[PDB]
Amino acid sequence: RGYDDWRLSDIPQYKDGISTYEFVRATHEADYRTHQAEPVAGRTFGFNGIGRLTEVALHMPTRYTLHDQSSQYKESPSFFQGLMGVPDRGPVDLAAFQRETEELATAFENNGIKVHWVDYPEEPANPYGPLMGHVFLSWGSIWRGGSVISRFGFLPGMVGVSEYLAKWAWNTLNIPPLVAITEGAMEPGACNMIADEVLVTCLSASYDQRGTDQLVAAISKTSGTEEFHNLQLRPAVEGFFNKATGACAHPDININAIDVGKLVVSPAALDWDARTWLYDNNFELIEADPDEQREFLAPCNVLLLEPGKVIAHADCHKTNQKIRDAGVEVIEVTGTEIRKACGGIKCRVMQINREPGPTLADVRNRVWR
Template sequence: MTQIRGKENEPLADRRRSHGFAVTEYDAHQEVLRQRDWKLADVPFYKGKGAEHDPFAWNDFDYLDTYRQIYGRRCGSAGIGTLREVGITRPSADDEYSNHPYFHEDKAYMNRDGFFLLSDVVDVEKLKDEAAAFAEKFEENGVKVYWIEYPEKPIAAFGPMMNMHSAAELAIWPGGSIIPKKGYALAPTAGLGRAEYLARWAFWNLGIPPLITVTGTGVWVTGTFLADDVYCQGMGVETNWEGLNQVTPVLKRVCGEDIHVQPIRTPGWKYFDKYTGANTHGGMVISGLDIDKVLVHAAGVDID
């Protein structure tokens, strides 16, 4: 393997690398498969010696039926069932807004969606403590926690990345991830590169491949499930109809054609309105708590 080197012909520091080539769960699964005594009987549609085989049988073979055999695990959530695994980003000094060069160049531009509501400074140590406590509670309740770490000073498409503590924008549905295309104020620094890193991390470390990347003029961020067959999508500056139309066919393929997709036309033109609480993230205005029990922020939803 060729070692990538810096300007002075020195190897990159460990913290600047996006991944180390460590043994993953996929590698462990591969090792288990190597020990198996494989027979043609393990192959779908094999009918035995001399039998006529239908070359089109594989056309109807669902990817979800074999996904677990390839990667050694199931993945994704669709509904409000029991949480079993979760990925949490490990906060670092790079999460400090006031360290970002654009923040000093034009604070009003960076804050036009009201991100810095209480303070211009992020207490990174407190953020680390809260993330650790959050993970501890998950583990106490039987949820497996994976820590996601970014390289030192990660770069997005248009400059230094920010808001790395937010991992939920990478939707993980049955069979893989959905890479969104951001459309709000901080898209240049937080939205064009962050989800791509998360998708790369999930594929390499956990065997979760991308199912689709939102492209063209579509913008989309993940919505929220109220049940196995009910999905709500906030519409606004974060998601437009082109984006939803790209993602909906994938949603139906992995969750079933009968799933109901309910658009929520969020009021206003901002990502977040600090006076009303309106938010273009569907999960911030409606959330399924239990069967027949939903939490709603009424000011943030329409009446459709």
């Protein structure tokens, strides 16, 4: 449209003969996401809900992506092993990491999902040392209404990274920021949603109440839903992972949706209140294999492409059979090298756009018991 062709009718609040007060009031009342964020961006965006995923980003590793190449790791491996708590499976192999990355990318293209590639500078560092954990682009996933700057609870090598990814989203995709988390801890990217307006968090190394409150209030306002629910798990875990039990600081290792009102869930995730809530809201639970969970094969770290279809680690054989048994298609993908750090396949995907999908009301109305 031409610069001199604009007219007052292009302003949605304008009406012929409207008063100043009524125009201003219509403006105060407009929805931020649909009046400002999306039009200005010139597109929709956000990973909220359990609808159809259409657009993601990955990072292809270099030597600088590997945690064991940091001089701070070299100085004390046991310090970082205490923070993450994941079983030692020996050093990361760069070439194999790159291959499993190509395979994941192929899986996306074979399922009609656009993949962007995020690079970091050579010798990437923040004010406190080499970047660490920066392969895990879910930490920069995009919410309805915009990007979020996280407060990392346990990993100093992620300081500056959620900024970097948000900046990248703005410069490359034109997607704006929504909020910076400025108190306590909140890593929203590692959360999952189990319905259009149901978020799962944890209270953990990665989340305190203040951080959670800040995040939930911001994403609530732009979620596009009348209601917003936060299920808050309470795992027993000091750092990121408890290799004695399989409990994890992050929701996305403990639980995810695999279909409408159907969840894959860890043995170590559900306290009584959480269990009661899932029960009252008609969610059907598929239990992850306990050994797969405890040995950190990340069987719950599946990525939902759409209700009834997930990407999962190819070697989570037992959990995957149970998912198939629940009527869900599983796309097996190699994810071995990625687990050598604190995460699996879902953890490493930055989700950019997911179309609106089924709601909590849909879950509740499902007849299955």
